Amino acid sequence: VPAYPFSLPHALDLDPHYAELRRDEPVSRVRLPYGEGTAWLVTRMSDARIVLGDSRFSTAAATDPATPRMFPTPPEPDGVLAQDPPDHTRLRRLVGKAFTARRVEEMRPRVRSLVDSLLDDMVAHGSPADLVEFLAVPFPVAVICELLGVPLEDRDLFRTFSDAMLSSTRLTAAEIQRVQQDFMVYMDGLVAQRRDAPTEDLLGALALATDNDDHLTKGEIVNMGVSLLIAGHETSVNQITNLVHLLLTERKRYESLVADPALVPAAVEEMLRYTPLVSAGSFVRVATEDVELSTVTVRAGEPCVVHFASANRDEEVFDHADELDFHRERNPHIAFGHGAHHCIGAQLGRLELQEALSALVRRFPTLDLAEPVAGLKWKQGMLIRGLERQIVSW
Ligand code: HEM
Ligand SMILES: C[C@@H]1[C@@H](O)[C@@H](C)C[C@H](C)C(=O)[C@H](C)[C@@H](O)[C@@H](C)[C@@H](C)OC(=O)[C@H](C)[C@H]1O
């Protein structure tokens, strides 16, 4: 009967319904915006983990246009989200060898230098300035270029492609396709260059063959490079803005990081959990077999959808879940998702946020929201929450 999403999202607030559903009906039936049929909506942490983690659920199935989904275009079956084991498991195994947490930490110095440069630009502009335009938008795409060892001259081409891939793209041409192909040929050439001469970047590592051993196709590598750019961009850009919003609207929080800069990483985790970056449910999971959740048993062929932010506010798991606490002992949030499809960029997402917050705290202890709160322009049509603009003063 009821439609999902329940209501239009306001700011980063959570719909009061979810909290009711956790208590009264953890697994509810719901009608999604675009597929045919009803689906199950999972609202609690244990259930969410089961749907995400257990092999009895398939994302590949969700590619059927008849299958319910949050977004208008049926999913592309090539998308790594839509990959099912064991082909998906191979991709993850191989890319996971190169995308270590150790490789990400080693980027931190170059990433610090990158934020510093962006902020210097913002100081050149003078207070007050749009933190979106100067920090949130440019920073993630630069970070990903660093990760792919793109030379500085060619980064222009990556920005255009990321902006063109977003559904909100202003240009919205027939030409988008022209950009896509132009970009694709470039990536081809970049991977071929890596095959000819090994580089220390993540493309370089993926290009290497121990030659008695498992490695990716050149075409697989190109496609993976595009996958990493797109997944990492939209989420990161808005997530930066969202953490800053939380920090400044109750400024006691930002002051807490000024006082103790070592608190930043803990704070980032807490804000990842607290922020409903994904306004809607999850990419759909269709049951290959009967599976037993908390309160209901899902029959094979029934579609499930997870709301990550609700799970993150589950009262069983988190004391004062509705409150924002940078001094939690444990924080097992699924802001990055869970199981097979755990965002690969989970470490590079954390790096990006920790480095943006630390830089702000270090260069601007006097940082404050210049735009009035009521004035704030939140993005309206989107799967992902974020501010169109965020004017700040220092
Ligand atoms: C704040 C930053 C980020 C957040 C909150 C985030 C969140 C997520 C979530 C929740 C998923 C899982 C969705 C599902 O399973 O239904 C996911 C998947 C993914 N994320 Fe992210 N992400 C972030 C940044 C990035 C970055 C920086 C990269 C890459 C550089 C990235 C690449 C991916 C990829 C490739 C997947 C696909 C998972 C798979 O099937 O292997 N994301 N992300
Ligand atoms: C990599 C990201 C990932 O973080 C996912 C989980 C974000 C949200 C929850 C989605 O999964 C969203 C449902 C996507 O799968 C697609 C609708 C797509 C159009 O959006 C996306 O393409 C976004 C960018 C995904 O590909």
Side-chain angles (χ1 to χ4, degrees), residues 50-101:
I50 286 164
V51 171
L52 297 165
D54 185 44
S55 57
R56 274 82 76 77
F57 295 86
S58 140
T59 46
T63 33
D64 180 4
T67 310
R69 41 169 200 281
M70 302 299 327
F71 42 108
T73 321
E76 261 57 59
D78 300 325
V80 289
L81 249 198
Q83 243 52 225
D84 261 3
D87 289 351
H88 180 260
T89 188
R90 186 186 144 262
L91 255 159
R92 274 305 228 126
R93 206 216 164 286
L94 299 189
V95 80
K97 266 184 170 165
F99 216 143
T100 46

Side-chain angles (χ1 to χ4, degrees), residues 148-159:
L148 299 178
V150 182
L152 278 73
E153 33 273 25
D154 298 321
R155 298 199 180 185
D156 261 322
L157 292 144
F158 277 64
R159 221 174 137 30

Side-chain angles (χ1 to χ4, degrees), residues 341-379:
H341 298 263
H342 192 257
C343 173
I344 335 193
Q347 296 316 100
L348 186 75
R350 294 199 177 102
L351 207 204
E352 271 173 15
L353 299 175
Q354 296 154 11
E355 271 315 304
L357 284 200
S358 282
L360 288 176
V361 164
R362 190 188 74 243
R363 298 276 295 266
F364 308 124
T366 67
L367 213 219
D368 211 355
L369 216 162
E371 196 167 337
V373 255
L376 283 164
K377 347 224 107 159
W378 293 100
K379 307 188 175 174

Side-chain angles (χ1 to χ4, degrees), residues 70-71 81 230-232 234-235 278 281-283 308 383-384:
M70 302 299 327
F71 42 108
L81 249 198
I230 297 179
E234 249 301 79
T235 50
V278 193
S282 57
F283 184 111
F308 298 104
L383 276 345
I384 299 193

